[PDB]
Amino acid sequence: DIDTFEEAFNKLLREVLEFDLQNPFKDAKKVLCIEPHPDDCVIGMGGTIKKLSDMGVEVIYVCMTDGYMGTTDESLSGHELAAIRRKEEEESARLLGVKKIYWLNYRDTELPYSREVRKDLTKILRKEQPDGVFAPDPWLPYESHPDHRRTGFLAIESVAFSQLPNFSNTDLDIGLNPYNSGSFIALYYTHKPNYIVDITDLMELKLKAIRVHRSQFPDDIWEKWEPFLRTIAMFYGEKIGVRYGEGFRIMPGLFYHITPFTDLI
Amino acid sequence: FEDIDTFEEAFNKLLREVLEFDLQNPFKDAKKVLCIEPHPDDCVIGMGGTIKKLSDMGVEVIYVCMTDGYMGTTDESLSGHELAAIRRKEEEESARLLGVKKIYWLNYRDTELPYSREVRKDLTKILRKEQPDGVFAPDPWLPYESHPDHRRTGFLAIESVAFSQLPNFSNTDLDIGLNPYNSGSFIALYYTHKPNYIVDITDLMELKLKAIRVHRSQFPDDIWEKWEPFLRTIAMFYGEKIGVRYGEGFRIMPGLFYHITPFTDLI
Amino acid sequence: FEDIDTFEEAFNKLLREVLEFDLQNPFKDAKKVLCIEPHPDDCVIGMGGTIKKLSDMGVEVIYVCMTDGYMGTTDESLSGHELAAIRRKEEEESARLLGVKKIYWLNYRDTELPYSREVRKDLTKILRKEQPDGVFAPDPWLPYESHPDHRRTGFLAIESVAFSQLPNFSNTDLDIGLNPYNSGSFIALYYTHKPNYIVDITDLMELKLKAIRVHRSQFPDDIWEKWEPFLRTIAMFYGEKIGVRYGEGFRIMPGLFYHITPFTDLI
Ligand SMILES: CP(=O)(O)N[C@@H]1[C@@H](O)[C@H](O)[C@@H](CO)O[C@H]1O
Ligand SMILES: CP(=O)(O)N[C@@H]1[C@@H](O)[C@H](O)[C@@H](CO)O[C@H]1O
Ligand SMILES: CP(=O)(O)N[C@@H]1[C@@H](O)[C@H](O)[C@@H](CO)O[C@H]1O
Ligand SMILES: [Zn+2]
Ligand SMILES: [Zn+2]
Ligand SMILES: [Zn+2]
Numbered sequence: 138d139i140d141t142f143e144e145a146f147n148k149l150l151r152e153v154l155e156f157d158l159q160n161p162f163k164d165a166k167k168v169l170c171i172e173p174h175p176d177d178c179v180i181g182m183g184g185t186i187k188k189l190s191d192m193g194v195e196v197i198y199v200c201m202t203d204g205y206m207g208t209t210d211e212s213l214s215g216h217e218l219a220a221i222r223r224k225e226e227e228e229s230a231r232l233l234g235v236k237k238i239y240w241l242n243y244r245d246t247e248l249p250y251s252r253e254v255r256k257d258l259t260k261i262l263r264k265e266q267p268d269g270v271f272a273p274d275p276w277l278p279y280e281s282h283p284d285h286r287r288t289g290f291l292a293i294e295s296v297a298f299s300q301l302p303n304f305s306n307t308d309l310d311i312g313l314n315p316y317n318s319g320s321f322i323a324l325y326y327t328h329k330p331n332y333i334v335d336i337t338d339l340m341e342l343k344l345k346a347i348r349v350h351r352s353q354f355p356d357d358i359w360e361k362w363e364p365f366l367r368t369i370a371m372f373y374g375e376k377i378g379v380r381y382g383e384g385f386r387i388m389p390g391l392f393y394h395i396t397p398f399t400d401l402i
Numbered sequence: 403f404e405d406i407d408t409f410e411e412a413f414n415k416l417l418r419e420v421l422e423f424d425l426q427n428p429f430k431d432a433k434k435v436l437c438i439e440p441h442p443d444d445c446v447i448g449m450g451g452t453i454k455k456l457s458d459m460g461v462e463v464i465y466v467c468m469t470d471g472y473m474g475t476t477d478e479s480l481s482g483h484e485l486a487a488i489r490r491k492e493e494e495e496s497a498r499l500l501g502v503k504k505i506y507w508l509n510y511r512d513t514e515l516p517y518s519r520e521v522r523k524d525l526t527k528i529l530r531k532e533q534p535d536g537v538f539a540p541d542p543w544l545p546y547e548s549h550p551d552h553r554r555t556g557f558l559a560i561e562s563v564a565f566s567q568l569p570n571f572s573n574t575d576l577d578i579g580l581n582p583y584n585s586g587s588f589i590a591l592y593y594t595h596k597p598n599y600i601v602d603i604t605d606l607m608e609l610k611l612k613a614i615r616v617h618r619s620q621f622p623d624d625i626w627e628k629w630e631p632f633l634r635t636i637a638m639f640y641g642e643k644i645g646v647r648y649g650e651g652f653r654i655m656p657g658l659f660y661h662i663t664p665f666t667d668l669i
Numbered sequence: 670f671e672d673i674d675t676f677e678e679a680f681n682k683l684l685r686e687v688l689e690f691d692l693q694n695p696f697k698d699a700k701k702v703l704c705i706e707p708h709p710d711d712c713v714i715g716m717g718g719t720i721k722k723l724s725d726m727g728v729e730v731i732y733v734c735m736t737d738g739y740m741g742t743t744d745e746s747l748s749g750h751e752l753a754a755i756r757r758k759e760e761e762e763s764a765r766l767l768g769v770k771k772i773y774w775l776n777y778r779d780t781e782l783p784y785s786r787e788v789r790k791d792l793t794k795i796l797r798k799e800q801p802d803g804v805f806a807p808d809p810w811l812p813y814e815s816h817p818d819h820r821r822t823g824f825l826a827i828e829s830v831a832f833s834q835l836p837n838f839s840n841t842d843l844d845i846g847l848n849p850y851n852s853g854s855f856i857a858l859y860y861t862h863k864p865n866y867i868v869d870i871t872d873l874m875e876l877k878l879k880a881i882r883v884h885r886s887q888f889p890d891d892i893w894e895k896w897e898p899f900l901r902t903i904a905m906f907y908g909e910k911i912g913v914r915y916g917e918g919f920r921i922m923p924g925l926f927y928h929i930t931p932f933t934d935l936i
Contacts, residue, residue: 142638149635153628181929206835209849215837246832247786252514276546278934279810281827281927293548298513301473303482315476328931364670364679364687365925371676372932384931391632393548395448397595397651398639400545403898409905412898420898519781543813560815565780568740570749582743658899660815662715664862664918665906667812 146401154389156402158332161321161387165268167195169261171292173273173284174245175204175222176350179229180366181325182271183343184336185383190234198230198238199261201254201288202245208352215244221352229349232342248284250291256305258295263313270296274324274386289324293393296322323385330384331402333373337380340370413668421656423669425599428588428654429536434462436532437502438525438539440555441512442471442493443617447633448592449538450500450610451603452650457501465497465505466528468521468555472512474620482512488619496616499609515551517558523572525562530580537563541591541653556591560660563589589660590652597651598669600644607637607648680935688923690936692866695855695921699802701729703795704769705826707807707818708779709738709760710884714900715859716805717767717877718870719917724768732764732772733795735788735822739779741887749779755886763883766876782818784825790839792829797847804830808858808920823858827927830856856927857919864918865936867907871914874904 139145150156162168170186172178178186178198186196204222205215213221226238241257243249262270273280275289298304299316309315323332336343344363348354354362367381374382392399406412417423429435437453439445445453445465456463471489472482480488490507497505508524510516529537540547542556565571566583576582590599603610611633615621621629640649659666673679684690696702702723706712712720712732720730738756739749747755757774764772773795777783796804807814809823832838833850843849857866870877878900882888888896907916926933 138634142635142642145631145635145638149631153631206832206838209834209836211836211843211849213837218837246789246838277929277931279922279927279930281824281831283824283828285928290548290550294550297548298473300476302476302478303480303485304473304513309478315478326929326931328933330931361687361925364683367670367673368676368679368683369929369931371673371679375676388546391628393546395544395552395593395636396546397544397593397597397636399595403901406901406905409902409909412902412905416898416902420895557815557817561780561817564815565740567743569743569745570747570752571740571780576745582745655813658895660813661819662807662811662860662903663813664811664860664864664903666862 146398150389150402154391156389158387161323161332162189162269165189165194165320167197167265167267168269168271169197169199169265169267171199171201171258171270171272171288173201173248173282173288174207175200175226176229176347176353177273179233179343179346179350181273182383183233183346184339184381185334186233186235187339187342188334188336196233196235197265197267198226198235199241199258200226200238201241201248202243202284203240205245207245218352222350225350225352229346232346232349245284248287250287254291255295255298258291259299259305259316260308260313262295262299262316263308266316266318268319269321269323270319271323271325274327277326278328285326293322321387323387325383325385327384327386330373330376330386332385332387333377333382334385335374335377335379335381336370336383337374340381413665417656417669421658423656425654428590428599429456432456432461432535432587434464434532434534435536435538436464436466436528436534438466438468438537438555438559440468440515440540440549440551441474442467442489443496443614443620444540446496446500446610446613448540449650450613451606452601453500453502454606454609455601462503463501464503464532464534465493466508466525467493467505468508468515469510469512469551470507474512485619489617492617492619496613499613499616513551515554517554521558522562522565525558526566526572526583527575527580529562529566529583530575533583533585535585536588536590537586538590538592538652541594544593545595552593560589588654590654592650592652594651594653597640597643597653599652599654600640600649601652602641602644602646602648603637603650604641604647680932684923684936688925690923692921695857695866696723696728696803699723699728699854701731701799701801702803702805703731703733703799703801705733705735705792705804705806705822707735707782707816707822708741709734709756710763710881710887711807713763713767713877713880715807716917717880718873719868720767720769721873721876722868724770730767730769731799731801732769733775733792734760734772735775735782736777736779736818737774741779752886756884759884759886763880766880766883780818782821784821788825789829789832792825793833793839793850794842794847796829796833796850797842800850800852802852803855803857804853805857805859808861811860811862819860827856831927855921857921859917859919861918861920863920864907864910866919866921867911867916868919869908869911869913870904870917871908874901874915
């Protein structure tokens with residue numbers, strides 16, 4: 138048929154796959170933002186969450202773990218800390234217009250990589266039938282937190298497998314349908330974004346909603362984290378020549394499997 | 403070697419002279435090879451053309467299919483049991499087209515391939531029995547590869563080809579009369595973004611695509627609408643790299659380079 | 670910091686003023702370090718020159734060896750139990766040439782290092798006991814690193830260095846009187862393809878190779894014909910990077926950059 142690989146690829150994307158990065162969140166009514174820990178959705182995409190909320194989109198958190206391990210305060214146990222972080226998360230998400238939060242309650246530092254966790258995410262996908270799903274990019278270089286890696290892998294896997302009636306089939310038996318339905322997966326916390334949201338306007342709000350997680354951001358930690366977080370927003374922004382941005386990686390569904398030229402988007 | 407001037411000269415001496423490495427004709431003396439696939443259809447999809455060419459050269463090509471394909475349908479009235487039974491039929495006939503001897507079915511459930519000592523011992527049992535001169539398997543470093551059965555197959559293949567050579571590894575194999583693996587001239591990895599050896603499959607493409615469609619349960623008309631162009635686009639990606647129309651890609655490296663090597667990108 | 674104009678300015682200030690990240694003399698002040706190796710011989714192969722230099726300045730080098738090297742022989746008359754007892758002695762001898770000191774043996778089996786909270790807890794206990802100023806471990810992101818003990822040592826060492834600081838993590842340690850890991854100034858990854866700090870080991874190269882060859886079970890004469898050139902070439906790859914003949918490379922980054930950082934390649 139076509140002459141060159143470049144023609145083949147271009148036709149693949151453009152016409153066969155209909156890939157469009159100008160407004161990929163344009164028709165979404167319901168989205169899941171999957172975070173490994175309480176606070177990750179806000180650090181990694183809180184500005185974008187605000188913009189979706191404001192636009193009439195329903196934003197639903199699925200938080201994989203409970204934040205149990207995240208303090209050096211020897212007077213605060215993991216149980217007490219987890220209770221405090223659910224409150225932190227609830228308030229921080231109100232500020233961003235966040236509706237609802239599914240807490241999976243795996244212990245922080247202990248998120249399994251297993252069929253079980255896939256079934257939990259699958260149950261939620263089948264219940265809520267979102268149009269889109271956000272999750273950390275499991276390929277981020279030097280990402281040393283297993284909760285992060287595992288979340289990203291489990292999300293992408295679950296978005297696929299929830300579509301298969303023979304996978305976690307008990308779901309169907311109790312009246313759920315397979316996942317439809319979703320228009321997309323977008324990965325945040327990524328080195329290779331190919332879609333950037335300007336949040337220059339929302340950066341102060343984002344910084345405030347982050348700070349609401351006070352257990353995680355006492356004064357002396359913020360002396361480092363605020364510069365760090367502005368510098369990351371500047372990394373993403375510069376890619377589209379704005380001051381503060383949030384970066385997403387989006388790809389056709391086909392590309393997450395056996396594709397040797399994924400770097401061409 | 404202690405006298406060699408520069409790193410660049412050392413690397414070329416190491417690669418060519420000490421390791422005797424070159425990609426002129428990697429499949430040269432092979433009488434027998436294993437093709438390790440995660441799911442029924444991966445062998446034909448990643449390397450069907452090469453399989454036919456090896457068959458044509460009188461190489462015994464043997465499949466190892468890690469999983470049963472149980473999950474791969476959206477048809478709500480087809481159980482995974484029934485689908486597995488189907489996909490085995492489909493693979494047997496697909497393989498027949500490519501002159502394929504024999505298939506080992508490991509029978510792990512699709513989406514549930516373990517990454518464990520147990521599965522390496524299964525692969526080792528086969529490598530010690532068959533004593534193949536080469537083993538093909540997916541590159542588990544494929545960027546954005548998001549199927550755990552694919553990544554796990556590839557890492558398990560590579561580890562097994564090494565560990566199956568150690569007599570204290572799965573030692574009961576030896577206690578029942580199997581020898582440690584050797585024979586093995588090579589490992590080659592398909593479904594790869596960094597191929598260094600390309601096989602021209604130009605006038606095999608139509609046979610390759612036919613052998614893929616024999617997996618009907620996977621490739622109905624509406625799926626084929628997208629997948630035929632996709633499969634053509636991939637083969638052109640590889641084919642272009644050596645200036646032919648359609649190709650299949652493999653990454654092949656000295657044995658040493660699968661461990662502590664900081665310059666694997668030079669090949 | 671609200672006012673800076675460019676990403677490039679923000680990043681320079683972040684690194685130099687906020688994090689005071691310095692790659693000029695990263696081991697300057699260290700009095701005690703841990704070198705974490707998947708198998709016996711990996712400290713010396715990966716960083717023996719460096720270990721000797723640290724020992725020369727009076728730094729106390731402590732090994733933590735994750736496995737017992739049980740599987741690493743092709744000799745059918747040597748069992749894994751006998752091999753592991755030999756390798757323990759070979760490592761004591763190798764380490765004594767480099768000025769080490771003390772070895773912690775985790776004793777997991779070679780090819781079966783778990784990736785789990787348990788192994789994190791073993792490392793966390795050493796860290797809390799020893800309170801080292803610096804920790805060395807393989808780079809688990811090395812391209813094509815196909816030995817699972819290696820990827821898992823690297824991941825677990827980085828995880829443990831962070832989690833051993835958290836009092837709710839493996840809390841029984843503190844209940845027996847250990848404090849959280851307090852002391853470290855640094856993590857350094859060896860066996861790396863993206864080193865950003867190189868120790869010149871030109872003078873030490875021959876000591877390194879001698880202390881490697883003391884692991885005789887691993888390096889008989891026919892293996893050493895391939896391994897000596899491999900090792901020299903690897904050292905020259907690192908060396909060239911600072912204009913010397915032979916070097917050892919490390920990747921060293923600010924602690925923040927091991928998490929959620931999209932610009933790790935700017936160091
Ligand atoms: C920005 P984050 O991913 O939420 N920070 C996490 C925190 O949630 C977690 O409790 C802790 C212990 O695992 O590791 C920290 O690095
Ligand atoms: C080209 P393939 O790798 O074999 N197609 C697989 C199919 O085999 C499998 O049953 C399904 C569920 O795991 O995932 C699909 O992604
Ligand atoms: C240089 P090394 O990392 O120490 N060599 C290891 C050796 O220690 C181990 O016993 C064997 C079996 O796992 O695999 C070899 O690849
Ligand atoms: Zn997190
Ligand atoms: Zn497959
Ligand atoms: Zn090792």
